[model samples]
Target: ASPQQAKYCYEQCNVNKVPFDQCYQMCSPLERS
Candidate 1:
């Protein structure tokens, strides 16, 4: 679940043209939750 979510987040971030690492900071469950 978390894996998919993280994968989804990175894909969305890439689609949105956002920085991957920056997206991870905001999108990651470890950081978000």
Candidate 2:
């Protein structure tokens, strides 16, 4: 994943405690799967 993408994901989530494996947000709606 790109730094920008991961950073953006955490912004929406408002939390950074998510597991690295589950951190495939990619800043997309389907990211929640």
Candidate 3:
């Protein structure tokens, strides 16, 4: 379920060439336990 959140991180960052580290911060809350 939560994995999809990271998928967005990839689509938004990986595709746009935004740093993964920044993506992690942006998407962090979505996957937080």
Candidate 4:
């Protein structure tokens, strides 16, 4: 993902108190491996 997109996802995860992997999974096509 692009840097901005990655940052947004990370921030969203933090704001929602969700795990980073879960945020990425929900917002993007990437999943935890």
Candidate 5:
């Protein structure tokens, strides 16, 4: 993923109070495809 997109997602997760590792896990699957 592009750094900007990754940063955006990470930030969104942070803002929404999602666990960082869970956010990464959720995003990782989408990224694999």
Candidate 6:
């Protein structure tokens, strides 16, 4: 996944551990869309 994907992932997920898959699902399309 891209850095920006994780960027919003953290912003939205607000997770300390950064549950990668969870954030990936949440922030993938959000990145390009």
Task: Please give the lDDT score at residue 5 for candidate 3.
Answer: 71
Q: Tens-digit lDDT track for model 5 on 1-33?
A: 576676777778878888979889766665554
Could you give me the TM-score of model 1 versus the true structure? 0.52
**Following a full C-alpha superposition, what root-mean-square deviation does model 4 have from the true structure?**
3.8
Whole-model lDDT per candidate: 0.75, 0.56, 0.75, 0.68, 0.73, 0.68
Q: State each model's C-alpha RMSD to the native.
A: 2.7, 6.0, 2.0, 3.8, 2.3, 4.8
Q: List model 2 lDDT by residue over 1-33, tens digit each.
A: 466765678565547566544555444544343
For TM-score, the strongest prediction is 5
| Backbone clashes (count) for model 2 | 0
Instruction: Report backbone clashes per prediction.
Output: 0, 0, 0, 0, 0, 0
- TM per candidate comes to 0.52, 0.34, 0.50, 0.45, 0.57, 0.40
TM-score ranking, high to low: 5, 1, 3, 4, 6, 2
| Backbone clashes, candidate 3 | 0
- What's model 4's lDDT at 27? 62
User: What is the C-alpha lDDT profile of model 1 across 1-33, one tens digit per residue?
Assistant: 467777788778879888878887778764357
Q: Per-residue lDDT of 1-33 in model 3, one digit per residue for the tens? A: 668877877678768776878877777777664
Cα-lDDT of candidate 5: 0.73
- Deviation in Å, model 1, residue 24 alpha carbon: 2.2
Per-residue error (Å), model 1, residue 11: 1.0
As a TM-score, model 2 comes out at 0.34
RMSD of 3: 2.0
Q: Give me the runs in candidate 6 sitting further than 4 Å from their true place.
A: 1-6, 14-18
Query: Model 4 off-target regions past 4 Å?
Result: 19-33
For candidate 3, the 10 contiguous residues with the lowest summed lDDT are 24-33
Give the residue spans of candidate 3 off by over 4 A.
none
Put down candidate 6 lDDT per residue, 8-28, tens digits, no spaces: 576868455557677767777
Indicate whether candidate 3 or candidate 6 has the larger lDDT. Answer: 3
